[PDB]
């Protein structure tokens, strides 16, 4: 069946137009709603359609603002029909794979993801985070399942803005957010005044998971999530508790020292990957690297080499096409992030 709908372009203008698609199939179903795969009749291009029961949709208002090579682009949006039931459909660029599926493959085969892919995926993830954080947008669901991949080009695109929120200081936010294994400790402590640094904690969990071949903090519950963190970071200090949640107080508790980072990972783990990870998985939210600072980390130096290639021999995807928006947290950093061979 060929489906014809009146849809509005994702970025501009607000001029609705007829869009026709075919080859419709369910590719995902969850609490959020349903995700379909379809083919646009006009260009033969593949699309993902995220259908949500729908007040204005927070996810749509965020998606309409974004245009970045490491973020799944919102091509169109259309409403469909109890009949009081209204569904919002987000027509997104299609991406065939996820970091979850790719990492699972290597894990099942008992082999580590090659270091070049760890650098490429993590660098693209930090770029997508530098971009959204510059608008005050926090994703709040950074996990391998939300990291889409083009297996041939090694392009990574951040998806699923269903948990995302534009954070405003002094306006409270829900603490029970983010998939458990990737949940920042300040969220476990019940913080409602947290910042976009919760996404950097989650990005550090993805990195460690890529180095280990399994999640670093596999909590079996909310409390067990903190147990898993303490096994690595030890107990937080009174000052770190205040930095995580100033509303939380605990006068007495047994002090546990951190486990050495070098023993958390397998012996052959690249020491620069461990160093980077130690600067992301910190109790103090403000001590975590910003995404732009993480892109400039020496672990990503191989990506800035002019002779760098994928193991399949293809060239690396676009890594240096930075915009003023993306560089806004620290504009002078541009001269370090954009190597001489990449400049016009």
């Amino acid at each position: 069946k060929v489906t014809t709908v009146v849809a509005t372009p994702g970025q501009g203008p607000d001029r609705p137009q007829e869009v026709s698609y075919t080859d419709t199939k369910v590719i995902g179903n969850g609490s959020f709603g349903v995700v379909y795969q379809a083919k646009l009749c006009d260009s033969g291009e593949l699309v993902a359609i995220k259908k949500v029961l729908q007040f204005k949709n927070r996810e749509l208002q965020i998606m309409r603002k974004l245009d970045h090579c490491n973020i799944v682009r919102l091509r169109y949006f259309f409403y469909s029909s109890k009949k009081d039931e209204v569904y919002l459909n987000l027509v997104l660029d299609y991406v065939p794979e996820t970091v979850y599926r790719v990492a699972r493959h290597y894990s099942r085969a008992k082999q580590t993801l090659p270091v070049i892919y760890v650098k490429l995926y993590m660098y693209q993830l930090f770029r997508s985070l530098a971009y959204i954080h510059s608008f005050g947008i926090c994703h709040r669901d950074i996990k391998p399942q939300n990291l889409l991949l083009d297996p041939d080009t090694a392009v990574l695109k951040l998806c699923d803005f269903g948990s995302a929120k534009q954070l405003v200081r002094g306006e409270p936010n829900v603490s029970y957010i983010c998939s458990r294994y990737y949940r920042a400790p300040e969220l476990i402590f019940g913080a409602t005044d947290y910042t976009s640094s919760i996404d950097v904690w989650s990005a550090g969990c993805v990195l460690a998971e890529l180095l280990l071949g399994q999640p670093i903090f596999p909590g079996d519950s909310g409390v067990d999530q903190l147990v898993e963190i303490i096994k690595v970071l030890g107990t937080p200090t009174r000052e770190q508790i205040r930095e995580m949640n100033p509303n939380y107080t605990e006068f007495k508790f047994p002090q546990i020292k951190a486990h050495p980072w070098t023993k958390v990972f397998r012996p052959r783990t690249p020491p620069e990957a461990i160093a980077l990870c130690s600067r992301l998985l910190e109790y103090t939210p403000t001590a975590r690297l910003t995404p732009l600072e993480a892109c400039a980390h020496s672990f990503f130096d191989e990506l800035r080499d002019p002779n760098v290639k994928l193991p399949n021999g293809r060239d690396t995807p676009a890594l240096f096409n930075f915009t003023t928006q993306e560089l806004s947290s620290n504009p002078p950093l541009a001269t370090i992030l954009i190597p001489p061979h990449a400049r016009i």
Binding site: S221, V223, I230, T235, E250, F253
Partner: peptide, 23 residues
Amino acid sequence: HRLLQQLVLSGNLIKEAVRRLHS
């Protein structure tokens, strides 16, 4: 979670997590 809410309200979260380390 209902247990977590309780530990956060009672200020016993770290103590209980340390106990669960088993210990």
